[PDB]
Amino acid sequence: RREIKIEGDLVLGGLFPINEKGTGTEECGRINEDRGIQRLEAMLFAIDEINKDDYLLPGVKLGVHILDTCSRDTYALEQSLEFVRASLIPLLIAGVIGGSYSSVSIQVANLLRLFQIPQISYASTSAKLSDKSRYDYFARTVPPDFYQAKAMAEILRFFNWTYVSTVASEGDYGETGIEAFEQEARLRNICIATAEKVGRSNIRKSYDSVIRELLQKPNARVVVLFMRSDDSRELIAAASRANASFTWVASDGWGAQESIIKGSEHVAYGAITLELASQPVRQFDRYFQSLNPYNNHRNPWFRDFWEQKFQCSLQNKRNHRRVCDKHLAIDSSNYEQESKIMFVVNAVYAMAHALHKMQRTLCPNTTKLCDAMKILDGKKLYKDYLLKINFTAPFNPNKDADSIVKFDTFGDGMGRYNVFNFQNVGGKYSYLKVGHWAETLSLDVNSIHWSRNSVPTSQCSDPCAPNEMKNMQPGDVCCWICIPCEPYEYLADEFTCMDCGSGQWPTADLTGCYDLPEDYIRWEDAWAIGPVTIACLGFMCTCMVVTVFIKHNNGRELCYILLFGVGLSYCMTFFFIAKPSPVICALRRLGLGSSFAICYSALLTKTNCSPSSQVFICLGLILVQIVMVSVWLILEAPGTRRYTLAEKRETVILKCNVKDSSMLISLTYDVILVILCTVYAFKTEAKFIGFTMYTTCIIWLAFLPIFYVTSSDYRVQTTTMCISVSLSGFVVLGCLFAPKVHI
Amino acid sequence: KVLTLEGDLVLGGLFPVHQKGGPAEDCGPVNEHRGIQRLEAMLFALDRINRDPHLLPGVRLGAHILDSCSKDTHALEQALDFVRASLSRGADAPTAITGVIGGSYSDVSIQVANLLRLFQIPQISYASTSAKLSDKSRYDYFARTVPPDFFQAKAMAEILRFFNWTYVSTVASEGDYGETGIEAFELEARARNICVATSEKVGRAMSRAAFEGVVRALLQKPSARVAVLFTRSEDARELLAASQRLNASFTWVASDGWGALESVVAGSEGAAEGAITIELASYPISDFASYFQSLDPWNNSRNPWFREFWEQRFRCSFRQRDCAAHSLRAVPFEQESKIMFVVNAVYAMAHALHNMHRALCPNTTRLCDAMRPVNGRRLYKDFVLNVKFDAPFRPADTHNEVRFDRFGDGIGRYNIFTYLRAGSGRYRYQKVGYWAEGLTLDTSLIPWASPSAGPLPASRCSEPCLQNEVKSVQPGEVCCWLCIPCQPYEYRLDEFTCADCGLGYWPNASLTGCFELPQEYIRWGDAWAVGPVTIACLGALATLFVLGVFVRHNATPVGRELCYILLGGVFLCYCMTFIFIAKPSTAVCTLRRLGLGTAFSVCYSALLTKTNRIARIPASQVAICLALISGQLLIVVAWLVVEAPGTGKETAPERREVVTLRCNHRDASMLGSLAYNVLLIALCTLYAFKTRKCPENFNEAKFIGFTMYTTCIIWLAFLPIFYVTSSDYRVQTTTMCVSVSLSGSVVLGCLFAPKLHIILF
Numbered sequence A: 001r002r003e004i005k006i007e008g009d010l011v012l013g014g015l016f017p018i019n020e021k022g023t024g025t026e027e028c029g030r031i032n033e034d035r036g037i038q039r040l041e042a043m044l045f046a047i048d049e050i051n052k053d054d055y056l057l058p059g060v061k062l063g064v065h066i067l068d069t070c071s072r073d074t075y076a077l078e079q080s081l082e083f084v085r086a087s088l089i090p091l092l093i094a095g096v097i098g099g100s101y102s103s104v105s106i107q108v109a110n111l112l113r114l115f116q117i118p119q120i121s122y123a124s125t126s127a128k129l130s131d132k133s134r135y136d137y138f139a140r141t142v143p144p145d146f147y148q149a150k151a152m153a154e155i156l157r158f159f160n161w162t163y164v165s166t167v168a169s170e171g172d173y174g175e176t177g178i179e180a181f182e183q184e185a186r187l188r189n190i191c192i193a194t195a196e197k198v199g200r201s202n203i204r205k206s207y208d209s210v211i212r213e214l215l216q217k218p219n220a221r222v223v224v225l226f227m228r229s230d231d232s233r234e235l236i237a238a239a240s241r242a243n244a245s246f247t248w249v250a251s252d253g254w255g256a257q258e259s260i261i262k263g264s265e266h267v268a269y270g271a272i273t274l275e276l277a278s279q280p281v282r283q284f285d286r287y288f289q290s291l292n293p294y295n296n297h298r299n300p301w302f303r304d305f306w307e308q309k310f311q312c313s314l315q316n317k318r319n320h321r322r323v324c325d326k327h328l329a330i331d332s333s334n335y336e337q338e339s340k341i342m343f344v345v346n347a348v349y350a351m352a353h354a355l356h357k358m359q360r361t362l363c364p365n366t367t368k369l370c371d372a373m374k375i376l377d378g379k380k381l382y383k384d385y386l387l388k389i390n391f392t393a394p395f396n397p398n399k400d401a402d403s404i405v406k407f408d409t410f411g412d413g414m415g416r417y418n419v420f421n422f423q424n425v426g427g428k429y430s431y432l433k434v435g436h437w438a439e440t441l442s443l444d445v446n447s448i449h450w451s452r453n454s455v456p457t458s459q460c461s462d463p464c465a466p467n468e469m470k471n472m473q474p475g476d477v478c479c480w481i482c483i484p485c486e487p488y489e490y491l492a493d494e495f496t497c498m499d500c501g502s503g504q505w506p507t508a509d510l511t512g513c514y515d516l517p518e519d520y521i522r523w524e525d526a527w528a529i530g531p532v533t534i535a536c537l538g539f540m541c542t543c544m545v546v547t548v549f550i551k552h553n554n555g556r557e558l559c560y561i562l563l564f565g566v567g568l569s570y571c572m573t574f575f576f577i578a579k580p581s582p583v584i585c586a587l588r589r590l591g592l593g594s595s596f597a598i599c600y601s602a603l604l605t606k607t608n609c610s611p612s613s614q615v616f617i618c619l620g621l622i623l624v625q626i627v628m629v630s631v632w633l634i635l636e637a638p639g640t641r642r643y644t645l646a647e648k649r650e651t652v653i654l655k656c657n658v659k660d661s662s663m664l665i666s667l668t669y670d671v672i673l674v675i676l677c678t679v680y681a682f683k684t685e686a687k688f689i690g691f692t693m694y695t696t697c698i699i700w701l702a703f704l705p706i707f708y709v710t711s712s713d714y715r716v717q718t719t720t721m722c723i724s725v726s727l728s729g730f731v732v733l734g735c736l737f738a739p740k741v742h743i
Numbered sequence B: 001k002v003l004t005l006e007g008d009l010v011l012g013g014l015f016p017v018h019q020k021g022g023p024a025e026d027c028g029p030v031n032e033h034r035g036i037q038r039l040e041a042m043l044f045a046l047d048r049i050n051r052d053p054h055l056l057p058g059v060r061l062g063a064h065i066l067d068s069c070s071k072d073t074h075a076l077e078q079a080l081d082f083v084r085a086s087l088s089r090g091a092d093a094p095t096a097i098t099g100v101i102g103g104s105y106s107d108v109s110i111q112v113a114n115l116l117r118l119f120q121i122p123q124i125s126y127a128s129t130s131a132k133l134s135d136k137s138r139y140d141y142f143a144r145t146v147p148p149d150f151f152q153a154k155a156m157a158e159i160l161r162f163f164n165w166t167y168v169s170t171v172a173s174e175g176d177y178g179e180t181g182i183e184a185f186e187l188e189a190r191a192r193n194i195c196v197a198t199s200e201k202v203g204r205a206m207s208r209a210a211f212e213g214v215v216r217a218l219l220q221k222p223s224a225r226v227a228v229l230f231t232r233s234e235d236a237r238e239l240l241a242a243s244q245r246l247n248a249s250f251t252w253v254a255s256d257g258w259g260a261l262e263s264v265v266a267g268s269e270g271a272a273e274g275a276i277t278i279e280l281a282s283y284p285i286s287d288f289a290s291y292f293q294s295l296d297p298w299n300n301s302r303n304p305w306f307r308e309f310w311e312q313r314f315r316c317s318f319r320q321r322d323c324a325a326h327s328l329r330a331v332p333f334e335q336e337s338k339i340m341f342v343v344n345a346v347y348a349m350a351h352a353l354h355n356m357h358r359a360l361c362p363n364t365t366r367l368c369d370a371m372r373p374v375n376g377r378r379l380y381k382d383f384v385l386n387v388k389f390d391a392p393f394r395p396a397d398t399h400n401e402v403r404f405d406r407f408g409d410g411i412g413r414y415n416i417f418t419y420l421r422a423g424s425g426r427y428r429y430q431k432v433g434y435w436a437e438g439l440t441l442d443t444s445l446i447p448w449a450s451p452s453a454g455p456l457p458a459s460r461c462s463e464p465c466l467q468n469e470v471k472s473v474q475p476g477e478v479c480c481w482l483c484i485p486c487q488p489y490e491y492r493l494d495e496f497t498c499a500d501c502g503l504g505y506w507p508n509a510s511l512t513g514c515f516e517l518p519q520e521y522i523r524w525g526d527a528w529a530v531g532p533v534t535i536a537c538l539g540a541l542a543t544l545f546v547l548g549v550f551v552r553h554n555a556t557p558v559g560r561e562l563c564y565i566l567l568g569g570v571f572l573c574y575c576m577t578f579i580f581i582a583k584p585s586t587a588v589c590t591l592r593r594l595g596l597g598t599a600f601s602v603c604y605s606a607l608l609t610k611t612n613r614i615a616r617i618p619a620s621q622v623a624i625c626l627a628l629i630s631g632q633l634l635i636v637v638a639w640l641v642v643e644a645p646g647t648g649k650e651t652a653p654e655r656r657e658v659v660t661l662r663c664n665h666r667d668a669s670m671l672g673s674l675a676y677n678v679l680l681i682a683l684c685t686l687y688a689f690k691t692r693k694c695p696e697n698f699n700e701a702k703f704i705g706f707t708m709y710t711t712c713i714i715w716l717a718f719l720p721i722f723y724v725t726s727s728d729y730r731v732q733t734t735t736m737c738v739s740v741s742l743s744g745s746v747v748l749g750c751l752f753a754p755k756l757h758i759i760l761f
């Protein structure tokens, strides 16, 4: 029935866990030392400071209506039912500074959203309270739990920890934390290896199983913890027996508490933990230390706290137990400030300032409680002034700019955490802050001690190189492995290698599908010096034999035509060899046909021996051969295709993309028939002509198959030119040895 | 005011006795049809339960009824007494609420359920049809007897599918009813594979001009002659008025907002001729009617609001008499439609309490020490939700089972009404079926569903097609597809793609790949080519004459192998023509190809030998012909090794033929042999320019010259003819056969013309 009802112009609700939950036959158990009396005393100190302040509500005096939760949701609901009997002696409640428990906060918010009563919590960090569909009048000065999921996941990105293993305790703290951390890791390209679940009812056998499952996965050397204090402590103790070394990344459940390590400091080292940042309040220590149960008559539970912190019976039944005197006091030897005190004050001001601003909007003519302010519209105050506060921390330390109290769209506080690294120094084990997360990373790597000189835990071995080495996934999830491709086809995509050219041979990763025709264009190389020299010698011989002619003549015109044909045959060798191949592919074929027709006419000149009529008839036959090769050209077209099917080894492209054995066979068949007729006629000077014709016929018969069976990359044209120039040279040798006998 | 009776087992209840305050007041006039009739129904149900042996025999059932005044805040203030008198106090005498049967408006029910969930007080509504009370995350201890608002959406979706209606319109309203139900209707329509136009909604403060504009917007699509109405009574009335003003013909599938109400069709009977509406199924209670009629303020002291209801109904003041014998009879009294639901809720709560009592106390029919701290969670989860009993004041031989599903909602049961005219100048609503779990429509009373003039055809936007692929669906509306006919050149290979194959334009309607029929497109080996082959047969007769020539060789004083060679060439070309015409095959094309070349070479060699012998003036002739034959053999061997097999060829894409060519073609190698023959003929003519005159065998020389000239002319005429016919292989073979047969016949005739004269002389 104990309650605080300090009267005032505006009465702020209060709700604290003064009494622990009774596990026996009593609803309320003991007196809570830290989260109980100390937090309500902090709220009372903040209220007194606000009342004494001449800049925050100078005229309006803030009242206090403080009740107890008994660490139970039903009891909290029953008590907070007194907060709604003002608009629906009763006291009008402007707001409720209550919380300290997620279930209690949830129940109180559910009850107070119906009656439009703003509520500010100082310790509730449940993620379930972040949605305004179910709690539209709830705010908190502490960040929600899932913020820590973003606090250390980026740490995984900071140290390049892409492969992690998650361990958590089932319930409400670690449950939502696992989903939040998994979402953050997926958004940060981090994959989860294992996901275990720790329970309060489990025993060492199942703990050892979790460690054993963790050990049989060498790639995952980092474990992300979402567990309570006892679970983390016992897990560290259990891993001590297993001789397991890890790099723990724990949430506030571990924090900077010395109870977690216990007698297992050699397995917890290098651990990274997150702690809610909270500066101490200097004035609160002085206010709380100078408190005795004689002047603090406004605190009904203060006598019980005096009888709990110190064994006292002076209030009642002095002779029953060990009575105490005023010698018992409070000092810095046995009193330590609770971590979540600066938040509680930050809650109270968060109301007062809002009210002040509300007054400046509704009662701007005087510094008093105007009648228009008596309505105390909860919706307007919450959605207009409570969520739009930017006041700095009332008791922030000197030179601390980052002390602004703000509420986001969901009413949550600003997320500011401290990163602690468990290190050994000298010969003493202690924690040491190595950075802060105020919505950004500020880690101090230079003062961080790792497990063994390094923390390598990446599952992916190494990024794959370019040039057909990028490969693709091998059947896994995290990263992939690297396998090569055959270099003929360029990796046009990031997964497969596909051909995009006849010869291709890609150059580097950039512009892999280059043109690179890889044609058979051959210059005057070592194998080409011979044919050109032979052609030059033949041309010189023809020039000499036509210069010696005409001047001394006593076939005539037929002999001149034969000499011209011999010169054409000699220059056909140079005509065949040409590095650039234009669209005019008929030059070589017409040259060969003209040479064959000239040889046929030269043979027919001796065959015939009216003679002038035969000299014209052989020219007419040459014209018929010319029209035949023209009809041939009317059926063959050039191109850019490659006749070699060696793919990667196909580094030579045919000069003219056309079927060589399509009508060239027919043309050579006609030539063979004509020359065979000439040979048969000659078989009936003349002997030398027949002999050289026979040598040419067997030479051509021998050189024909090798141009098709060998299929050389570039030597087919060279061999054809060599055969032609050899035949022409034999004919010229005969036609030059004949004058040698003549002279 | 409060309404407290007994107290052994107090039952909560909230009723809208007073309407919402107009002039900014708390409560206004008394709601006669929603606050008094339902209150009296609950009281009558409680009395019947009390005076009942098989339900709560030894335990009495009380009541703590309150007025909500149709306000959520006032309802919250009144419901605070439900929790403050049962468990809030401690761990006007407070009364322990066991269950709450109340809540008519959706917002009131939501607020009351939100308040009562925290205190584990079960609540059973009787008129809250809101769809946002179905989730148990926010309302754990809420149950209802009436079905939610998406059951009628499901019913209309099933109705639309039953009548084969796909492309339909949609009209909605602003608020919970009209926006929450429209989303559910769209979801089931997607699940029903039907199309929703999703037209504009109504803001309940909408001008006549805007209503007319929305009517024109609905008239924009002519194929969707069906509109769905998730609108309130006033919105539906305004829409009917607008449709009547604009003279628009429509059929409207409506919801409970329209129902079987005659107040929305006043002055708009012409616009509504095939209107389909859904009304929540309910039946009247005769016992409740008897109980309510025999009610007067003289003895009805239980109801604090009865005096106000009497004053509002009958003009009486109770200070000055002004009234006497104003008994409430059946003439001005009509039973409200949701009164059986109140009785069902009260009886369900009573049955749940009785079952819990029997389970906890199977020995005695009286309260135990374990029943004082009743648990709302256990009662709701194990007893309230698990109820299966016949509806009271209704014979048990009827499918009326008051049950709650897994979400605690009621059992769907609706009636379908058609706004029709029986034939006279009057209009009325006629029931045409019911929806409990499936449609039960009868096609016997609906006017537009009669077989005459069709059953109001309002089918999908488009129509199915067979020869036109369905691949032109309208962008953004896949419900109006265009039957685009694919070109006949492209066959059907997939479900909706018309793609060509090459081996035929349209094999069949299998719609699975392309079929290549095995046939020959140049199969001219029939009577059509009867004329050419017979000519070849004539050449065979010439071969027989060759045998006679052999006999003539035995007694002719006037070389002799040249005639045999010519006859052999004639036989060879005749055989080549026969092979080409009778049967074209891979092994039947190369043989004739070699044979024609061999015959041409033999003829050329014979002509060359004859002209050489003429110009000169048996071993030499034999050597020359052997050399020519060897050259021809080399040429044909080169042709064979170049390409021996024949795989055929395909036709042009402009048509679809079976086989363009029997074997390989488009080769100019035969042009080489043609040019060689032309050159040989030219050489023969050049020699005969002076050698033609020969006294020795003058007739033979003249015949040889004439044969050479005729062969040259035939070749010169046939070469352009062959080039022209190469584009049409159907007649090219016939033309070539005719040409070679004519050449052979001409040669034979020229050879035999002087022989007959010489023999006769």
Ligand SMILES: N[C@](CC1c2ccccc2Oc2ccccc21)(C(=O)O)[C@H]1C[C@@H]1C(=O)O
Pocket (backbone or CB within 6 Å): A035, A100, A101, A102, A123, A124, A125, A126, A172, A173, A227, A228, A229, A252, A253
């Ligand atoms: N802020 C806390 C967080 C709390 C918590 C913190 C660390 C480890 C376990 C753990 O148990 C849960 C479970 C669910 C939700 C919140 C928590 C809160 O109660 O909301 C708690 C410090 C506040 C207080 O009780 O003083």
Ligand SMILES: N[C@](CC1c2ccccc2Oc2ccccc21)(C(=O)O)[C@H]1C[C@@H]1C(=O)O
Pocket (backbone or CB within 6 Å): B034, B104, B105, B106, B127, B128, B129, B130, B131, B175, B176, B177, B231, B232, B233, B256, B257, B338
């Ligand atoms: N069951 C109703 C349905 C109601 C409703 C019915 C038709 C048209 C408009 C309309 O307004 C809304 C809006 C949201 C949810 C429900 C409704 C309820 O009030 O919940 C109402 C019959 C019950 C009664 O008041 O007696």
Ligand SMILES: *[C@@H]1O[C@H](CO)[C@@H](O)[C@H](O)[C@H]1NC(C)=O
Pocket (backbone or CB within 6 Å): A158, A159, A160
């Ligand atoms: C993480 O990787 C980035 C580049 O991928 C590198 O710059 C950075 O130094 C790495 N951090 C480490 C190794 O801690």
Ligand SMILES: *[C@@H]1O[C@H](CO)[C@@H](O)[C@H](O)[C@H]1NC(C)=O
Pocket (backbone or CB within 6 Å): B162, B163, B164, B455
């Ligand atoms: C709807 O179409 C189906 C064809 O699937 C037909 O069997 C049925 O009779 C139709 N119903 C009508 C026209 O009401």
